[PDB]
Amino acid sequence: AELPEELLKNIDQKDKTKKRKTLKNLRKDSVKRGKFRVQLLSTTQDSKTLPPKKESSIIRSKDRWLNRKALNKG
Protein backbone atom coordinates (compact mmCIF):
# COMPACT_ATOMS: atom_id res chain seq x y z
CA ALA A 1 0.00 0.00 0.00
CA GLU A 2 1.23 3.48 -0.89
CA LEU A 3 2.62 5.44 2.04
CA PRO A 4 0.85 8.70 2.97
CA GLU A 5 2.61 11.66 1.38
CA GLU A 6 2.55 13.46 4.74
CA LEU A 7 4.79 10.81 6.32
CA LEU A 8 7.31 11.06 3.49
CA LYS A 9 7.26 14.86 3.63
CA ASN A 10 7.74 14.92 7.41
CA ILE A 11 10.72 12.55 7.31
CA ASP A 12 12.49 14.58 4.62
CA GLN A 13 12.18 17.87 6.51
CA LYS A 14 13.50 16.28 9.71
CA ASP A 15 16.43 14.55 7.99
CA LYS A 16 41.16 4.94 56.09
CA THR A 17 43.78 2.73 54.44
CA LYS A 18 45.93 5.69 53.38
CA LYS A 19 46.08 7.03 56.94
CA ARG A 20 46.55 3.52 58.36
CA LYS A 21 49.77 3.32 56.36
CA THR A 22 50.64 6.79 57.68
CA LEU A 23 50.15 5.59 61.26
CA LYS A 24 52.30 2.54 60.47
CA ASN A 25 54.94 4.92 59.13
CA LEU A 26 54.45 7.06 62.25
CA ARG A 27 55.18 4.19 64.67
CA LYS A 28 58.86 3.81 63.81
CA ASP A 29 61.57 3.84 66.47
CA SER A 30 64.36 3.45 63.89
CA VAL A 31 65.62 5.56 60.96
CA LYS A 32 68.93 5.71 59.07
CA ARG A 33 70.97 8.91 58.68
CA GLY A 34 74.36 8.97 56.99
CA LYS A 35 76.43 5.91 57.86
CA PHE A 36 74.97 5.59 61.39
CA ARG A 37 71.59 4.11 62.25
CA VAL A 38 69.57 5.95 64.93
CA GLN A 39 67.04 4.44 67.36
CA LEU A 40 64.31 6.18 69.38
CA LEU A 41 64.41 6.17 73.19
CA SER A 42 61.21 5.80 75.15
CA THR A 43 61.17 7.38 78.59
CA THR A 44 62.63 5.20 81.34
CA GLN A 45 59.83 6.01 83.79
CA ASP A 46 57.28 4.83 81.21
CA SER A 47 59.00 1.45 80.85
CA LYS A 48 58.84 0.99 84.62
CA THR A 49 55.09 1.65 84.52
CA LEU A 50 54.36 -0.76 81.66
CA PRO A 51 53.84 -4.40 82.73
CA PRO A 52 56.57 -6.92 81.86
CA LYS A 53 54.55 -8.28 78.89
CA LYS A 54 54.84 -11.77 77.34
CA GLU A 55 57.23 -13.41 74.94
CA SER A 56 55.54 -14.30 71.65
CA SER A 57 57.62 -17.41 70.94
CA ILE A 58 56.75 -19.16 74.22
CA ILE A 59 53.03 -18.81 73.50
CA ARG A 60 53.48 -19.79 69.85
CA SER A 61 55.58 -22.78 70.90
CA LYS A 62 52.59 -23.75 73.02
CA ASP A 63 50.19 -22.98 70.17
CA ARG A 64 51.91 -25.29 67.67
CA TRP A 65 51.87 -27.84 70.49
CA LEU A 66 48.17 -27.22 71.17
CA ASN A 67 47.33 -27.65 67.46
CA ARG A 68 49.49 -30.76 66.95
CA LYS A 69 48.19 -33.77 65.03
CA ALA A 70 48.76 -36.16 67.94
CA LEU A 71 46.27 -34.18 70.01
CA ASN A 72 43.49 -34.69 67.43
CA LYS A 73 42.06 -31.35 68.55
CA GLY A 74 40.08 -31.16 65.28
Binding site: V31, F36, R37
Partner: peptide
Protein backbone atom coordinates in the same frame (compact mmCIF):
# COMPACT_ATOMS: atom_id res chain seq x y z
CA UNK B 1 92.06 -2.10 59.90
CA UNK B 2 89.03 0.15 59.43
CA UNK B 3 85.95 -0.52 61.53
CA UNK B 4 82.80 -1.93 59.91
CA UNK B 5 79.90 -1.83 62.36
CA UNK B 6 76.50 -0.31 62.95
CA UNK B 7 76.41 2.69 65.30
CA UNK B 8 72.92 3.29 66.65
CA UNK B 9 72.50 6.81 68.04
CA UNK B 10 69.82 7.30 70.69
CA UNK B 11 67.34 10.18 70.97
CA UNK B 12 64.33 10.64 73.25
CA UNK B 13 61.87 12.54 71.05
CA UNK B 14 60.55 11.23 67.74
CA UNK B 15 60.76 14.80 66.43
CA UNK B 16 64.47 15.04 67.29
CA UNK B 17 64.93 11.75 65.42
CA UNK B 18 63.38 13.18 62.25
CA UNK B 19 65.74 16.14 61.83
CA UNK B 20 68.76 14.18 63.09
CA UNK B 21 71.80 14.97 60.95
CA UNK B 22 75.23 13.27 61.26
CA UNK B 23 76.96 16.64 60.86
CA UNK B 24 74.96 18.29 63.64
Amino acid sequence: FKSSGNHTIFVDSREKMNEFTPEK
